[model samples]
Target: NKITPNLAEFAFSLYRQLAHQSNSTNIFFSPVSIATAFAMLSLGTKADTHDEILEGLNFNLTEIPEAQIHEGFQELLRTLNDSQLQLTTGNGLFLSEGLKLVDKFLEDVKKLYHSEAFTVNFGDTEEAKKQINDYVEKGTQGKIVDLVKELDRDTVFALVNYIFFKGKWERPFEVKDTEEEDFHVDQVTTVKVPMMKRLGMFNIQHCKKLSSWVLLMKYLGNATAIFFLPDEGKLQHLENELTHDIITKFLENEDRRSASLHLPKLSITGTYDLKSVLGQLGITKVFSNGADLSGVTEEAPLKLSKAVHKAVLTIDEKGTMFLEAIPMSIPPEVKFNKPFVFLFIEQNTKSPLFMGKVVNPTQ
Candidate 1:
């Protein structure tokens, strides 16, 4: 349970770094998927290499043992997915043909990490690329088409983590209420986008540090979407001040109120080649020749060649078929016409399923 919170915190930390890197575009990714991929890889590392990967993942080595960390992931996968949740995940390792991977390393990931290992003829670069990309496409229900564009001839291995999710809200926004409205990309730019409207009582707060009003929207399943709208031109300030502690505090804060909600209907996809970003987080050795991934295969020298992540999310007015009686107080209006940050999270575990910042909704 403690690890779950720490993982969520790390997710926000990663998101903060990612936001800094791409300030002008929409951002979204599943931190859980990224962490899971590396955690699986860590099982094959030796000596200091193992410690470095764990540290990069934001784990305090002295506090939690290596085995416990893997167990936490195992428990996480068991609880987060089922037929009803609509959260499906796939983790796999693509090994170059003729690279003899150690049996223990292969067995460990399969048993504990829930990933299947496959051998591909990397010598045939085009065929190998298609094989890897096709698996990702099918795994993600076609949401993610190409994860691997081309493979270098000398490349020995590639690791991929893919997640696809679709869930309706507990209270659906009326389709008829959806209309085109202005979404301010920034101070000087505005674009018309399809925005949805709803009137109800929900958990909401005005955060002083970020000068933002936060709202929590529930899904039909055990998940919620939290949105942050910063005061004009304060989006960057809000991000600079964001951390796990601050985010957790904001999430835990409950100020239920009645209000009219206007949120853009979101359909966005994000792709990131995380090698550089992970390096910035202190995960260096794994990407270089100095890497010690002996656990995977000592035969031909195993090193991580690529770490790619892709995610797709869609939010509209579809929810459970029950209606709540309107409250007496006329709720204050909360419209997302400007830049804002939003996080999709599992309600029960507090795990971040996806995180994003919307500037121009049409883009």
Candidate 2:
């Protein structure tokens, strides 16, 4: 049977809904799209040779892409032993382990996106736990971000990988600048939140529409971090209305304008369960019964359980060095404080997958 327009709509909308629910700052769905496309394509190949035949196989490129927004959203879960890293600290350990795990994560993700079919692998609990402990230690800069507390067969059967970050404004909020302010979650309940203030020409941008506010800050060479703060009372509308078209259009139009912006220096840390969003997007096959993977493991039953990401960006006293996690709060709005949307667009593709929104926060 042909994959009808309605079916495609259902698929994409499912992704959007979960993306919203997770409050994903900037999510890229191309990997999942590519994986699904390849899965279907491979299925077609089997159909062509087997006793059964399927007709009219087609993949929609216009709706998705050869590479969809590639902050690259997906889920990952695994188990490992604790014996992997017995020696490694400070900047030496930091750069080494951080580079290792991040590289491995990227490679794993790349494999999924490039493969014709995707399947997760679960491995030896002993050795695997070591790798993970190192990974978690370094990934969070020693903050202990994951749920795995010990290392053994029972202690390490399965583990969740997570990243967390915390930071403060580049220019520390003067004690005088800190004040209790009412935050407008909607129009009804104005929660009292401690508001911090700072005056900076935050690599800001301009918006032509009053309904939304978008901002961008570059922490490194051309890697621009962005935040999207929708105008008060418009969050629900924006969330419900977001579509691929709207996103693509924003990248085209709003992104093109020169921006005169001022942002109150702040910090934000966002955590999301990769599986929750993926499951919500109708992606049960990769994790459950339909999974097809012989690449990474020999285990008959294997699937990804979770991929938690905690990221932090702060503008504070000694400049900025993006840290992983410390446990700070990030709200969704900042009234006169110039709260807005932001993105990290690569200079070449002008593509942004790291997005955030600042509401109200406490230090």
Candidate 3:
């Protein structure tokens, strides 16, 4: 068996945790990106250092071994790229001019994580920052203009992860059909945003168990966007009840019908402070001075200095991909008029590529 099941569980678990941490602010992140980095990082650790990292990733090691976990990721990466879903992710290792990685550790990361090594002079504050950001910006097609915001003078090694995806709708919406409409932010507040509309057959269902209406939009590539519209004031209830299995069951049990749908155009990015989040999740040793990264280097001790994750999504009538245009809209029979949760998934593996809660799409 592969790690997709574990990955899906981790995605749902992390999304809920992030929601509680956010307190209703706009939420977005790539679960796969964060998990893959730590999984690869585990290669440079041992004992408690290694166990906590894998445990924090929600992996159960009692039955499955560590190498098998990475085998799944290698296969996961291979499938995502070859499946032609317009989604691509790559990792990087940036070390100070004179630093070096343990030969085996470097080769292991390079082979399994698709890591490309770079040498940077961290002495200049803005120099290494620009190098990482420029590389990520190009890889993300400028969507991630400044991936790394700050740097410390004593920093030695840096790890970078970026995810890029663009998918056109199966049946694209027309820009002319987009109009300004009031999107309810809550029981009282509302804001006008450009909403895209299309009248066609859609795979939708109202799950009694979830007490929410759902919409499934297919991208031309195999990936699909699934949105859950909970009844007014029931978003928290729905969030509490949602599980990867429940959502997957909902998708498989689709109810297709003809209807007009309104979705606001969007350009939103969800940035997270991984240092704080990981501590809350029990992935602590690696971030502390007692860190045991002897596997990475024995010349001196090594530990993580910074870990940040940011995911950006751009949506228009043409369909969800990337291009920072801001006019947004919401729809009719299934109007996403209230706060709704969105998930972009890689269909073959059923892995959630991106997750978000659009309280206000215009943001």
Candidate 4:
């Protein structure tokens, strides 16, 4: 059994675009969650629109059958739930009360994706917003709240995705060791934030090409967080060279090492309006009037109105360690006090769970 590569590729592609667009702020997005929502929507597309959705998602429709795409997502859903990680992901479709969804479309999404359609009065945008936001809040165990703020009054339907993860480090840091420290926002800017320290064995690598050092930290479950810090002022250069292939090479290489690593306690959230970004990535048909969601309903020319994604990640030291490093004269030090990139990936599928840049941790 082989894991699908399209999803992983799509995840990193979205990450790079989002990173480039939002270069100055802190970001945290769940690629799997966003892709899953789009997958659910893809089930309702037909003709050229169907082809466009698949292509936008990095799938070759000629090679992978429509059913196979659905099946691949079904398998991923099962794996994500069964992995036993402290993570919760949910996909939702909120339709206006008067809109009638094709019975087969609703049934297929329910059966394959484990999500059900809910009818709401989109005419009352506030009520609609509150209902959907509350659903996201409950789905993520209150880690995310008020996820959807504004809704288009003419919107007949809205798709939502939410993911929340709270992973414990393989080696817990002593709470007493956490202290307020300076985090460099840029060459001259700094802010005070709580930094967590630990001296342990980690899979750390220094990438010469990017002039950056990467540190891989494992969670107690099936997830791992990799942080990258460019040499002093090369954050932009490092980002320009970031790609799925680069990360794959970094992970595949046996460059694990022991170090005295100090990382900041992160509690970050990212919100995105992905409609335009998705358009830039060759998924434009779904957002235009030429869209054919005929599979969903013939009642009206149905097109995607809004696509929003929100995610939250909180990493702390609260678990036990599995391995101890061999002693040396002086342990190598890798500190994340400067601006850096962080990616949370699932080990089995190697899919990106979340990706972001930390410029101002205090914000």
TM-score of each: 0.94, 0.50, 0.91, 0.93
lDDT of 3 by residue, 109-204 (tens): 887777677778888769889998888888777778788888766677777777766667877888899999889998899999888887776788
1-363: candidate 1 lDDT, tens digit per residue: 667766876786788888878788888788888888888889889877888888888898999888789887887776775435677778878888798789998888888777878999888888888988989988876888878776667777887777766768777789999999988786777899999998887788788987898888777677788899898778888877766666677668666678899999888878787677788888888878888988888866777887777777777777325766677876888999998998887766677877888877768
Candidate 4 error regions (>4 Å): 1-4, 253-255, 319-323
Q: lDDT: which is higher, 3 or 4?
A: 4
Off by over 4 Å in 2: 1-134, 148-210, 240-265, 298-301, 305-307, 313-318, 321-342
Give the clashing residue pairs of candidate 1, or none.
258-331
**What is the TM-score of candidate 3?**
0.91
Clashing residue pairs in candidate 4 are none
Error of 4 at 27 (Å): 1.4
- Least accurate 10 contiguous residues by lDDT in model 1: 77-86
Reference-based TM-score, model 1: 0.94
lDDT of 2 at 194: 57
* Tens-digit lDDT string for candidate 4 (1-363): 132478767876887787778678888888777777787888888888878777888888778777777776777777787444788888788877786679999998888888868998988889889999999888877788888878876787788877788887776788888888888887787888899987776788788987899887777777788899899878878877777767777667665566887889888888888787788788888877888888888778767787788788786767322667567757787878988988888776777778888888878
Provide the overall lDDT of each model, using Cα atoms, as 2-decimal numbers: 0.80, 0.37, 0.78, 0.79
In candidate 2, what residue range of length 10 has the lowest lDDT sum?
A: 86-95
Cα deviation at 98, candidate 2, in Å, is 27
Q: What would the per-residue lDDT of candidate 2 be over residues 120-153, giving only the tens digit for each residue?
A: 1224444444555566576456655443333333
Candidate 1 residue 319 C-alpha distance from true site, Å: 6.6
**RMSD to truth, every model:** 1.8, 11.9, 4.8, 2.1
